[PDB]
């Protein structure tokens, strides 16, 4: 019995996922389900179950497709994906979040640039990102 299969054969998962699927527009059931799926993975690291990571990613993506205006969940999903080790998909998540606001979102731009400073490490590209952000 693996962690992923033990989670997927848990009864609470069915109830939470059914509440989410029955009431897509409440976001209370959405957030409860996301907290449960994240908490059931006690260690978040590079060695945890790939199926469990894919499930967490798909849950976050579905919620962000349902509610496009949640800045904090865009930031949290990007930070979690950063923690998992890869930064290309973190950049993709941040750019998708910026596009969801038509590039005008102060919290997303601030968090994106704060993350960008550590990662890009190229003066011209970083400063061009800053000029693009300041225009919007």
């Amino acid at each position: 019995m693996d962690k992923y299969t033990a989670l997927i054969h848990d009864e609470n998962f069915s109830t939470l996922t059914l509440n989410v699927s029955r009431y897509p527009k409440s976001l209370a059931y959405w957030e409860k389900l996301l907290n449960y799926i994240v908490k059931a993975s006690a260690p978040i690291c590079k060695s945890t179950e790939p199926q469990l990571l894919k499930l967490i990613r798909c849950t976050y993506s579905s919620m962000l497709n349902e509610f496009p205006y949640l800045e904090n969940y865009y930031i949290d999903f990007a930070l979690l994906e950063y923690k998992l080790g890869n930064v290309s998909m973190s950049h993709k998540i941040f750019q998708r979040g910026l596009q969801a606001f038509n590039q005008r979102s102060l919290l997303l731009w601030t968090s994106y640039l704060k993350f960008c400073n550590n990662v890009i490490s190229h003066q011209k590209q970083l400063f061009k990102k800053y000029e693009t952000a300041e225009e919007y």
Binding site: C45, K46, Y82, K83, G85, N86, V87, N118, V119, S121
Partner: protein, 91 residues
């Protein structure tokens, strides 16, 4: 040796070090030993061809390190001064 003691003094501050394979690493320096073994924390790695990833910790053998970049403020370290006073160690 002075450089090993300087790397020892550089604990707890963000250092950047490049290995002999071509990779680059930067992050908090947790511990270092007399043989240049270092343990970086929250390191942001650059593999030789340019890709950049992230890991929680790393322990790189000192025989592979090319150079280590410590914060610039350590130039004023007390162990870089030549004329020093000693407390006359006891018996």
């Amino acid at each position: 040796g002075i450089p090993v003691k300087l790397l020892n003094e550089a604990q707890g501050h963000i250092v950047s070090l490049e290995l002999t394979t071509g990779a680059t690493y930067r992050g908090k320096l947790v511990e270092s030993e007399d043989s240049m073994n270092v343990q970086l924390r929250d390191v942001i790695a650059t593999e030789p061809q340019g890709a950049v990833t992230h890991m929680d910790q790393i322990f790189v053998r000192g025989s592979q390190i090319k150079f280590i970049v410590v914060p610039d403020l350590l130039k004023n370290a007390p162990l870089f001064k030549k004329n020093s006073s000693r407390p006359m160690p006891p018996i």
